[PDB]
Amino acid sequence: VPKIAFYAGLKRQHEGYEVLKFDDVVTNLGNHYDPTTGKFTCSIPGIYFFTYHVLMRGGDGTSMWADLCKNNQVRASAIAQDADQNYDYASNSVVLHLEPGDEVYIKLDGGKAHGGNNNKYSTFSGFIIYAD
Amino acid sequence: VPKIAFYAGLKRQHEGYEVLKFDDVVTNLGNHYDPTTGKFTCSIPGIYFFTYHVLMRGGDGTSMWADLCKNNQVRASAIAQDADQNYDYASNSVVLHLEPGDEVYIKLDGGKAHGGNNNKYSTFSGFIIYAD
Amino acid sequence: VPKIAFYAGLKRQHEGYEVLKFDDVVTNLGNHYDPTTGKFTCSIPGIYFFTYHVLMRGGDGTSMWADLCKNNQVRASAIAQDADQNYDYASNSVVLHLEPGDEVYIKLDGGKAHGGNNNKYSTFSGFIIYAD
Amino acid sequence: CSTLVKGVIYGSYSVSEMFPKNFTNCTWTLENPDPTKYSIYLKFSKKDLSCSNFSLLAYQFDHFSHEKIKDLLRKNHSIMQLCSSKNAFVFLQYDKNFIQIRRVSFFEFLVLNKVSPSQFGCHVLCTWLESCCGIMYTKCTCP
Amino acid sequence: CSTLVKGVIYGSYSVSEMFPKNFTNCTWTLENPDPTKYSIYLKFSKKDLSCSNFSLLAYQFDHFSHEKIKDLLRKNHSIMQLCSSKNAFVFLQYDKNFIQIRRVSFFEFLVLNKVSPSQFGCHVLCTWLESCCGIMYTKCTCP
Amino acid sequence: CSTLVKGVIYGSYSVSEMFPKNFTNCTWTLENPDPTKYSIYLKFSKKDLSCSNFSLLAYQFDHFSHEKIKDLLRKNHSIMQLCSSKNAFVFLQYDKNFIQIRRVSFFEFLVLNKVSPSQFGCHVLCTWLESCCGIMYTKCTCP
Ligand SMILES: [Ca+2]
Ligand SMILES: [Ca+2]
Ligand SMILES: [Ca+2]
Ligand SMILES: [Ca+2]
Ligand SMILES: [Ca+2]
Ligand SMILES: [Ca+2]
Ligand SMILES: [Ca+2]
């Protein structure tokens, strides 16, 4: 069986509309996630489950959108909003079908994420459930 | 051996105490989720994992309860609350044992959900982990 | 695949830097989760997925930290914060590699968790994905 | 001696009904279905209630634990003294998971919805508004 | 007869362009890409717009359902009457998933970003600020 | 030349101790364990501090990157100048992931808990309250 599963915290703060690069890689079983680019590139076709928790940076920015983007389409959207500028999460979970080359990644869509260093507040988890 | 896994966003907004019908189906392996009714009907008995993220409707309603109901009983409860009426998620995650016919569904228990068209802010994910 | 999977809600209120004991056990396949201590002790080494949702108490308490601690180290951190003292979840998901004896548990790192009785607002889910 | 009335939006109990045992040491409990959603309001009638050889202890807690009840009793800094209440009618609010009344003339409670009170629930509370005097009332307003 | 203009930050449509059909019963729709993020502002020009044999109904909804449109029309309590508007220019804000204008002289809309308006988006709205008069304007400020 | 003091609630360092190298180009770093939870307060003493042939640069950042430090230095719009500080004692608050002091008389810092300050932490800060003058003090109050 194929063993694909990863989890990585967000070591560095992000902002704007940039792909989140979760460099705090705890698990990268199969090495199908690349912290340098921040994209999970499928290699074995199959149905994968991805969950991401992205902590909105506290203090500045009352809204943050973190969309799990599959290739060039937004396959999930999460909004972390707090009018008092608190640490609310923009989290969501997806069960997507993926073909080889499909780059699944979390992209900020108009907010400032939180750089947890080694704390691993903002995370990106995901694993293959079945292989086609 | 059996491949059951679904994911669907909430195309239409909801309100009150009605079953959430996630009609934005991205994955419906086995066709064991019905967007018309909004219920995942188990057919192959086994241990299933369900996660749901339900975005509270911003602007109106300061609290929203989305309980993952198994048959006629609340197997999980999630409350999205924000006194400033923001977009907070009533998300939760369960690992339930299911027999054939057990209809697992996300049911609002107050407050108004958010309808995101194809955005898929509010989602219902779930897959079978083991079969008996 | 050996069958390890659990899910439990928070029957009793919690507070301060103490391990969360999710005693409202719904699934405890393999009996690898102990509600009396609140720790999931790995026995068969392998790659496990854990998710926890921890509702923080409304009323008293403005911020609550719930870190999924693996043995003596924080493998994920979640902060539930709301300046208006609302209900918010300190949730996060991890995909950790575990050896026999590793004790994964959710420990509050400040603030008070909500005791949901049978409601199962605050939950602790997790299952083995691969048996090494 | 412990009976718990689990599912009731409203309930009227006499002193004899809530303690239907010869032994004077009994506990009557009322479980709040969801403290995130509901706030339980208690009402005490002293029209015929007596405490010649009985102690009325009104308190709340979160989980069933005898040591917790003992520690709360030894605290004795916020436990209600129903017998030693000057006003004839006692109104109490308990936004906690459990409410227990132990024994050492009736009383009615109300499991109100905190944010969206039902038509019946707010009607009962509006009748309890006839205290006389400081009272606790919710968002829903009624003349 | 139903065309929907899905992806546009801005758009100028004449009455003839938005209803390019001989049949007088047609619907013109504008999908809000993300109501969590964007608020659609509508602008109506009555300089050459006429309603001698045409009805202009301006409304919003959340999902495509004919029964919903019929019920909203029968409600007739908040539907805008473009023809019966005293002011020459009509400014409307629609923070809902769909905007549809049905037919029973142009008009321009603006899919503005709610929290971080773009340079062009706030520039267009600042030009619409020339109403004259009560108007709805957003956080972004411009003389 | 880069040493980082990772885990310390409190720490007192002399200029010689924090830069124990003959080379004048060195960086001393202090990692904030959790900016969601802790705010690092810095204290600078100019009683015997001298800058005859040394430059004291006080700044903060989020990640280890030489290019980031160079860009911050080229910015030079909010970097603290310890040597050119009129007041004898300099109090700085740094609610960011890293604090680095580079070299081109001691100083003490405090990793305080932002929301629930410990007994020791709020005591040390209460002593630092003797600035004289504008200062930044936390929620915890002390005479
Ligand atoms: Ca988006
Ligand atoms: Ca419920
Ligand atoms: Ca939240
Ligand atoms: Ca921590
Ligand atoms: Ca919140
Ligand atoms: Ca708030
Ligand atoms: Ca507020």
Residue numbers in the entry:
A (entry chain E), B (entry chain H), C (entry chain I): 6 to 137
D (entry chain B), E (entry chain C), F (entry chain A): 4 to 107, 125 to 152, 163 to 173
Study text:
The adhesion-GPCR Brain-specific Angiogenesis Inhibitor-3 (BAI3) plays a crucial role in organizing synapses in the brain. BAIs are a family of adhesion-GPCRs comprising BAI1, BAI2 and BAI3 that are implicated in multiple developmental functions. C1qls are thought to form large 18-meric assemblies, suggesting a higher oligomeric state of the complex and a potentially different interaction mode.
We then determined the structure of the mouse C1ql3-BAI3 NTD complex by single-particle cryoEM to a resolution of 2.8 Å. At the core of the complex, three globular C1q-like domains form a trimeric quaternary structure with four Ca2+-ions bound at the trimeric symmetry axis consistent with structures of the isolated C1q-like domain11. Each BAI3 NTD interacts with the C1ql3 trimer at a composite interface between two C1ql3 molecules, creating a heterohexamer. Furthermore, C1ql3 Trp188, BAI3 Lys66, and BAI3 Tyr67 engage in a π-stacking interaction that further stabilizes the complex. The second C1q-like domain in the binding interface also forms extensive interactions with the BAI3 NTD, where C1ql3 Tyr244 and Asn242 engage in hydrogen bonds with BAI3 Asp63, while C1ql3 Asn240 forms a hydrogen bond with BAI3 Glu60. In summary, each BAI3 molecule forms a Ca2+-mediated interface with the C1q-like domains of C1ql3 that is characterized by extensive intermolecular interactions and spans a total of ~564 Å2. In contrast, the trimeric C1q-like domains of C1ql3 bind to three copies of BAI3 in a 3:3 stoichiometry.
